[PDB]
Design a binder for this molecule. Sequence first.
Ligand code: D5P
Lengths: 258, 285
Amino acid sequence: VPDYHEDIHTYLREMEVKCKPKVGYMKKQPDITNSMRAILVDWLVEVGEEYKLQNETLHLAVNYIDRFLSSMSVLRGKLQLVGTAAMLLASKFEEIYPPEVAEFVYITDDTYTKKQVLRMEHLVLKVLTFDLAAPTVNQFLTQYFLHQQPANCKVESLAMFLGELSLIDADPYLKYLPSVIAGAAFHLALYTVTGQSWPESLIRKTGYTLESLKPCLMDLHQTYLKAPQHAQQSIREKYKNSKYHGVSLLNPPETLNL
Amino acid sequence: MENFQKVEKIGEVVYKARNKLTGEVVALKKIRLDTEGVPSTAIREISLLKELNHPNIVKLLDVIHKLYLVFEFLHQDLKKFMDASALTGIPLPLIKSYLFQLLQGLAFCHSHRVLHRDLKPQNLLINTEGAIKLADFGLARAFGVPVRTYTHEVVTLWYRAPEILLGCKYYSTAVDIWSLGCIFAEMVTRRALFPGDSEIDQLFRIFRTLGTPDEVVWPGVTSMPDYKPSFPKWARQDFSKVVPPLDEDGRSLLSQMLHYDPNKRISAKAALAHPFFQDVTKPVP
Ligand SMILES: NCCSc1nc(NCc2ccc(-n3cccn3)cc2)c2[nH]nc(C3CCC3)c2n1
């Protein structure tokens, strides 16, 4: 293993605590709700598919939105402008070929002007004090995938699917750190596809036992069981593609036997 | 901006300036914002330098909305120091100090999941007290474990690693080590190791010095997208001819920094432990 893998993991574990949004922020937002956030995140999943953006870009955009809404009151009519600026910034940070501003305007169907998107970009940068290099569920998942005995494309696709569903529902997923969500998503995907469990090598790397992951796992199991009923369906549609081994079509396990 | 007196243009725009209230001498990096808003290069440089607090990385002091990045000022870059030392040469202990410090800076970048991707002498800043610092993080990227495909058009040609020239799907930390190997040789011999004038000339300059790589030296090389079985097969030159002034330890380290196979090329952290650095000191230029 490269001699900086452990250093990066230790650093990302420090930064995920510093980049965490305020867990109870939505109760202090006078005009927006968890449901309007779910609608915005589901919409960004679709924007990502339309522009063939990385999963990481979507995860970063959600981190930026939750951090912005942690300190700034936003009316429902402007929530999509925050999301659009977040996705533009996430794209500039993470993408080889970020979509142009005129494309972000087009994808809002001219709800906002170019000037509005560029002014919101400045404001998001100011509120986040240019701290864009946030750890994501995705960054922990790709590290955890190196511990597979052996590597299984369905396990990887299903763990990504599960980590993505967590983005939609601020209740309960804002209670958990990205490293913990990734741990639950990886265990649940492994167990579903192969009947294997959270491996000893990841217990040593992370210090997480299956027991420490249990609260998050129980939440993520319910999310998985109820996904076909959720009002938001863009992530299920995405993970039906052959790109993702159609993993969203698999049956969730009935019990986890924890 | 009213608190800064521009002294002069030092790069291109970077100005030497003075804080009118505190007297602090700074470098102002002006980024023009004119139709896509804040450039990705500025967003990456600011966000990544905020996590890269190290004695061998240039300090970002402030950001002001135009967009001005306020940095610490250093008196000279390694390119101008090299030009000034072309007749004398850089003393061996100072070459060793500078490489040791560049590797400390780069090891810190890699340990914080940052690729520099433009290490060349003009981006390496020196002060009057014998420090050298990595600068210009406009081409840098936060990388993932493991990497995915990143921008292909990276590193100034003379300092560009063979896995980029041959179009590997994946590159990572090893590309920075390649650039520093080139810079090490350049400090020793007083000229660019691989001064290519095109991608093909750059590759052939590498092949003529280190030997045309084969499946034993670099497993997978003959399958790489821009590899051609018609490439001439040159033999490897003896490092006694490539870097004549360099001792056995120097030659061992340079050869490990220029390994063809990125998976075998020495890491910044392992380079710091090499016996070449056993007697390292911090002379003043
Ligand atoms: N590529 C080198 C030019 S860009 C540069 N140079 C610096 N210092 C070297 C220098 C000083 C004065 C002169 N000079 C005087 C009269 C005319 N030229 C030229 C070179 C810097 N110190 N700190 C920086 C921050 C990192 C981003 C800005 C910075 N940049």
